[PDB]
Design a protein around this ligand. Sequence first.
Ligand SMILES: [Cl-]
Ligand SMILES: [Zn+2]
Lengths: 163, 163
Amino acid sequence: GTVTDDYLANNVDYASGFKGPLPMPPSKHIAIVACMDARLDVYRMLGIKEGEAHVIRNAGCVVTDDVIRSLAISQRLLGTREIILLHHTDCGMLTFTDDDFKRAIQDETGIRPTWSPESYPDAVEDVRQSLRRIEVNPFVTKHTSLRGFVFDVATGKLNEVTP
Amino acid sequence: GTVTDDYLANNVDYASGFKGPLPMPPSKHIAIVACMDARLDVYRMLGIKEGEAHVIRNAGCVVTDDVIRSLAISQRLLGTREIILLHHTDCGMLTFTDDDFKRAIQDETGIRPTWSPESYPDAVEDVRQSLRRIEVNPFVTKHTSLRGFVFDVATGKLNEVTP
Ligand SMILES: [Cl-]
Ligand SMILES: [Zn+2]
């Protein structure tokens, strides 16, 4: 069997004790943007319960156009008004560079991706940068709170970053 | 205070129980592509433990270039070889079409987004189209298992989708 079979079996247990359905709009009107990193259980990290929060995740917790899209939909159609950005210490994007990453891919495949791999060398700096990307975007404006943090993978603590 | 404030207070208790750091690569070598939807606790849904899985989430669980980027990074740099794709019953991605959404935005802001909103009419059929995007993408080739599921917000059950 595979891990997917394993996780599917776990879903049976989850299903048996499931309470639902809940309304679609986030009850706590908040959106989290975070990293796909395996060590971030975003829900337990923030004490989130089902139905409270949108959670968006990608490699590097990068504010791409997909995140902008997802946030726009979140705010305009589902009434979220707060945004938490999560980066973290020891994160994957610190270990590599775009130019090297695309070069390796072109070696194997013969082509370079059209998209940017969006690596960055410093978590704290990039939270600031990430905050600036949301601030300057004309479609994500319905928030009354926008704050960014670095999750410490060694201690579990969230440390705020000043824009 | 704000919801963000309450969530930070939750993190204090989280960090109290925290055990780390864990190694960066996912210990189960699997990536989950899921939805930001507030009713999906992806970790609990699949019995996921910290350090085991990459979890990617956006609006509508769409395989955008950002998801391909994140999968490519996940596979090439951090060794994942299984992919689980999730959609969900009762999509808010049904309630709107792209063109309508974009028009509303342009009416409000004067500006039309460059990005596709990526709405779809049917979750099940779009799981099939999602699976197809990954399979024919040249940058996400390393997986040995690629499977898609619709998550029922009323029962908590995953229903696999076949191509
Ligand atoms: Cl999550
Ligand atoms: Zn990371």
